[PDB]
Design a protein around this ligand. Structure first.
Ligand code: K
Ligand code: MG
Ligand code: MG
Ligand code: MG
Ligand code: MG
Ligand code: MG
Ligand code: MG
Ligand code: MG
Ligand code: MG
Ligand code: MG
Lengths: 136, 82, 283, 404, 404
């Protein structure tokens, strides 16, 4: 995700605030700001489209098998949303490397709450507050 | 917070420069996937480097199978008319 | 022998003027009050031997609540070692700059929004005559301005005015030669200071963590406020800092995680003592 | 020319914060220097040896035309030199204290203290890690900012540059009125030294000594559990063992050894001490470490010349500032003499050899006045002016006078 | 001939700060020198030793026939040496600062400064990394351009060549007024040194110490997983192991060692220090490194002669420029004396043995005047001109006069 400044495109700094960073192994190639979930023992992969797959956001671009830094819950992050969002909206991994609202998803509870609204395809600021896994 | 691998920080890293310089000097084609690790292409953003093999010295060096004149190992961009 | 190109090219830098262009108070407390006296009145026609009625001084205050402005940065310790430049010095410079820009936003947004007078140019006579008219608007409230704060489009338009651009009309060719660095630009319509502002400075409310002002800052379209003509002694910028007089920048290591950071802070408010001492110029 | 400096000085506004510095050093950096000095061990001892070489041999005050200064101070006559020696009775200790501080920290700093009667008492040093200067657009100090640990709260205050004094041995430039800490300048080298020393100590513990490895059970045979090994551990326990214990076993017990694995920690210690002593400008010998070839001949003469030159530079730098910023103000404000007189403070050479001076006096005394000989030999000059000023020995003048 | 140069020079058409390397001397290059200077460690200490050798031994002022210059300056006599000694009281420190700067940077540079009453105060140095000269088409400096850090940005200004002064020790040619920095000249050698130092330090961390390698499981037997090794890690944990820890195991645990993998880092250190010292023109010994055969006899005599010649060359180059561009203007503009007088500023030889001088005075004093002896011996000449000008010692003249 990107700022534009004249000719230049700058990558956004993903992590706004938060001290709880943790290291994992990439199960596949991943890019900065993607939501990820556990896919093997300490191995993280990109989150699919509804609930039950979120541990945190990947902080930097990786090849498969490289070490990954996550921002987990308790972090504030700059993340791209696939739809227009507003303050107080709960958001969820979208399956597309973006987030979307809980309201749009098939799920009933989110993983982060929007603090600063954004248009479709634009960077919101959100607080990550929960993880989601396999409940059946 | 910004890590050493984080996308907004890559241009500050001495290794990002050193390794992109290596990649240009080592390359034999613009087809990165033929030659470089998925790690290298991601970590050093090699899609954004102007890699084509034109900076590799061995693109310009003669290596004929029989050499009676000691011509092999000469680099054509070091000749008088280059 | 792979010698790197060591240099880093700078970004856009905003103009910083609030410390010069307003009365700075270095406050002892983060909240406080400036006492204001009532306006002068007229003595009363009185019969001989009648009681003299009272109409003494009355007083009020303008309160300050210095808002804490902050800017932080954190980097992995491993990267401080691999950086092409002093990466902590660069973050100190950015953090200090973000605070100076913060002061200037607080100042300019108070200055533009709470000016009690306005001169509407109605898309015409926008150069010297607008400055003279805006002084006239402040003069009708019996204050005297001495400073003007100006948008880039207002400056651009003003230096096209033949009264400034022709050497014989200005009595000097400095405006044609040196533009905003000409001595006449800081010595016009009785004003003895010019404070050139940046476009991004005013609080549009589009920036994160800021909730916007009431006006539009600009000089490009019907209704934009492009300049303010005012008394520098009647607008206060109040700075509070717990650990000194001014901006405090602190370095730190995370005690656990091999992270280093730099954090800046300053508390600032801006308040008109007398908003009648100020007039905006409008497109 | 001009009466104000017309070149600028690269320093105004403290960078991005002024009265508390942005980029320039802070109270926390000052306390970092204090922690290095406090901590003991080898680094603290080396920088104390540096202080002792520069300032530990004591001092002498000189005045040119001192005799012409003769004046009654309290009915008693004094010269300016006699008065200064009474004003600064313990100057040898003060010079070592300030001279030490100005090598450690960017500056030594202090006050002039009066008696209650308003006569001069002392030049009082202040704790240099508690104080930092505020300086102007031409780099001169205008105020001093202090903070002190005071029942946990930092008592904090500001003092004018008017009544403090300060001295800088180490400067970034001739216009630098704030100076450089040699500790902060070499912060990385000090840490590299400490880390390597810790690494060597841990390596000696793990690898410097053999360790007994008892292997139990036959290869490919019956396995042995933890409780089975605990009974064997009791038999071979080093706590209980003695130098001539013998062992009896079946064929399926082996007493192997982790040998002490050879590594040249002595060479690592030499290398660490070389890096540190060179970084602090000392010779390697100051670190209790020797070197081949360097201990003899012209190679020795060079390094001890480099050390003596470094000492002379520090001594001159200190002496000038102490005279100009401590002594002259005291003469001006509390003394009946002319403060514009040519006062000098010499600080002694720590490596001077009296035997070398005695050889010199034997060889060339015929060309030296008795005052010059007395000064070289570190003695009072003769009490009689013609005896002091003449070139024959005083003992030779005495036997002439006895002949007459 | 002619009154102006008619051979051209390699200048870039004038206006530029054109220097040796066929390009323009930028403020970035100037601050790169400042970074090598301020950053401490071994390179900084070596170029400090170079400054101390060239300029640390202090200075002496001579004027030829100065006894003829006797003039009332302020109702009282001086000679030009006496006036200059009052004009420049702390010249030893100034010479060390400027001489240091002129070895580090392409030039030392500064101002003349006046008192408020308009008489001479001092020659005031300026920070050389802040100032950049502009040459014309014949190479001569016409202006000084300055930029300086100030409150988060930079000030910038231009000053005329007409009222600064500058001194160049190292030149591209005898016509070069911009000079060459030895730090920029040897930038690659300095970086090669720093990189090899870092490489050795890292290699010592990885390879200088043995490391324990515990292997678990039988070869071709049952596999052991990470979660199983995690428990074995607890048992042989190097953090909590001690010198005399013993181990008990089954047959299917092997306690191997990564040996300290021997490499001659001492020789790599010597080779790096050899490269750096020779590049900076210091002898090898200045680096706390020695070599066989070179420590004694004619091999030693030669390298010490080469060092002393290099010092004398720098000293004369500095002295001439300081007299011609600082002292003569100060005499001309603020003194009652003639500026065309034969002034010399001489800088002391750092490597004199006064014992060898005393041997010389013993052996051949019979051929020297008492003044010449006093000059060699570094003492004031005798107060009475007839004894100063005579050949036999003042003690011999005294003992014979006492014999009358
Ligand atoms: K959906
Ligand atoms: Mg938090
Ligand atoms: Mg209140
Ligand atoms: Mg009444
Ligand atoms: Mg009333
Ligand atoms: Mg009104
Ligand atoms: Mg101009
Ligand atoms: Mg005016
Ligand atoms: Mg079995
Ligand atoms: Mg099996």
């Amino acid at each position: 995700a990107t700022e534009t400044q004249g000719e230049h495109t700058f990558p956004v700094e993903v992590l706004i605030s938060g001290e709880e960073l943790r290291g994992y192994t990439a199960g596949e190639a991943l890019s900065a700001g993607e939501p990820v979930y556990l896919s093997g023992d300490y191995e993280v992969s990109a989150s699919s489209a509804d609930g039950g797959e979120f541990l945190g956001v990947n902080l930097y671009d990786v090849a498969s098998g490289e070490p990954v830094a996550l921002a987990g819950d308790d972090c504030e992050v700059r993340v791209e949303v696939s739809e227009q969002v507003t303050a107080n909206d709960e958001i969820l991994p979208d399956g597309l490397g973006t987030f979307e609202t809980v309201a749009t998803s098939a799920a009933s509870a989110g993983v982060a709450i929007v603090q600063e609204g954004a248009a479709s395809g634009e960077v919101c600021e959100a607080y990550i507050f929960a993880v989601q896994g396999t409940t059946a | 917070m910004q890590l050493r691998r984080s996308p907004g920080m890559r241009p500050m890293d001495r290794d990002w420069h050193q390794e992109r310089a290596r990649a240009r000097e080592q390359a034999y084609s613009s087809d990165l996937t033929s030659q470089f690790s998925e790690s290298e292409i991601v970590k050093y953003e090699l899609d954004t480097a102007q890699i084509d093999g034109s900076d590799n010295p061995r693109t310009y060096i003669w290596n004929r199978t029989i050499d009676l004149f000691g011509m092999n190992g000469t680099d054509v961009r070091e000749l008088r008319n280059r | 022998r792979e010698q790197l190109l060591e240099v880093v090219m700078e970004g856009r830098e905003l103009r910083k003027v609030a410390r010069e262009a307003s009365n700075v108070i270095n406050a002892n407390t983060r909240v406080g009050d400036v006492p204001i006296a009532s306006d002068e009145e007229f003595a009363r026609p009185t019969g001989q031997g009648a009681e003299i009625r009272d109409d003494g001084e009355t007083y009020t205050t303008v309160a300050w609540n210095a808002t804490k402005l902050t800017e932080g940065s954190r980097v992995t310790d491993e990267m401080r070692d691999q950086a092409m430049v002093d990466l902590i010095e660069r973050n100190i410079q950015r953090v200090g700059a973000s605070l100076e820009n913060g002061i200037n936003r607080v100042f300019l947004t108070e200055l533009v929004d709470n000016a009690q007078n306005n001169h509407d140019t109605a898309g015409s006579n926008q150069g010297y005559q607008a400055l003279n008219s805006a002084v006239g608007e402040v003069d009708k409230d019996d204050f005297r301005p001495d400073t003007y704060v100006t948008h880039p489009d207002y400056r651009t338009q003003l230096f096209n005015d033949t009264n400034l651009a022709y050497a014989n009309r200005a009595g000097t060719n400095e405006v044609l030669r040196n533009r905003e660095d000409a001595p006449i630009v800081g010595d016009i319509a009785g004003l003895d200071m010019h404070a050139a502002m940046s476009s991004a400075t005013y609080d549009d409310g589009t920036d994160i963590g800021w909730s916007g002002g009431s006006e539009t800052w600009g000089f490009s379209s019907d209704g934009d406020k492009g300049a303010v003509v005012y008394d520098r002694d009647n607008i206060h910028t109040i700075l509070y800092a717990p650990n000194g007089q001014d901006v405090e920048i602190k370095d730190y290591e995370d005690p656990i995680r091999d992270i280093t950071g730099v954090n800046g802070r300053l508390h600032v408010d801006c308040q008109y003592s007398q908003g009648r001492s100020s007039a905006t110029v409008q497109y | 020319a001009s009466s104000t400096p017309q070149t600028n000085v690269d320093s105004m506004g403290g960078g991005h914060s002024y009265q508390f510095n942005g980029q320039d050093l802070t109270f926390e950096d000052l306390r970092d220097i204090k922690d290095v000095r406090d901590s003991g061990g080898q680094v603290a001892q080396l920088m104390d040896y540096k202080a002792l070489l520069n300032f530990g041999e004591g001092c002498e005050i000189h005045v040119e035309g001192d005799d012409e200064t003769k004046q009654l101070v309290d009915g008693e006559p004094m010269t300016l030199s006699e008065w200064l020696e009474d004003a600064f009775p313990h100057l040898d200790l003060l010079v070592l204290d300030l001279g030490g501080d100005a090598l450690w920290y960017p500056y030594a700093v202090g006050e002039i203290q009066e008696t209650i009667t308003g006569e001069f008492k002392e030049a009082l040093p202040a704790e240099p890690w508690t104080l930092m200067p505020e300086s102007d657009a031409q780099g001169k100090v205008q105020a001093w900012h202090q903070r002190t640990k005071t029942h946990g709260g930092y008592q904090t205050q500001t003092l004018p540059a008017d009544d403090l004094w300060h001295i800088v041995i180490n400067k970034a430039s001739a216009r630098d009125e704030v100076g450089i800490s040699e500790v902060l300048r070499n912060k990385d080298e000090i840490q590299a030294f400490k880390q390597n020393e810790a690494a060597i100590n841990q390596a000696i513990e793990l690898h410097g000594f053999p360790q007994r490895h008892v292997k139990v059970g036959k290869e490919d045979g019956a396995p042995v559990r933890d409780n089975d090994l605990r009974r064997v551990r009791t038999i071979f326990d080093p706590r209980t063992t003695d130098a001539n214990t013998a062992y009896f076993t079946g064929q399926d017990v082996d007493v192997e050894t982790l040998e002490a694995h050879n590594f040249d920690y002595s060479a690592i210690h030499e290398m660490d001490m070389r890096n540190l002593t060179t970084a602090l400008g000392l010779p390697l010998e100051a670190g209790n470490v020797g070197a081949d070839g360097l201990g003899s001949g012209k190679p020795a003469e060079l390094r001890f010349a480099l050390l003596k030159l470094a000492i002379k530079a520090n001594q001159r730098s200190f002496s000038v500032q102490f005279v100009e910023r401590v002594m002259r103000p005291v003469v001006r404000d509390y003394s009946p003499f002319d403060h514009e007189a040519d006062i000098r403070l010499e600080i002694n050479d720590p490596l001077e050899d009296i035997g070398e001076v005695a050889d010199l006096i034997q060889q060339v005394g015929d060309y030296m006045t008795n005052e010059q000989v007395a000064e070289k030999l570190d003695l009072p000059a003769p009490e009689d002016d013609e005896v002091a000023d003449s070139y024959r020995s005083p003992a030779d003048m005495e036997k002439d006078e006895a002949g007459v």
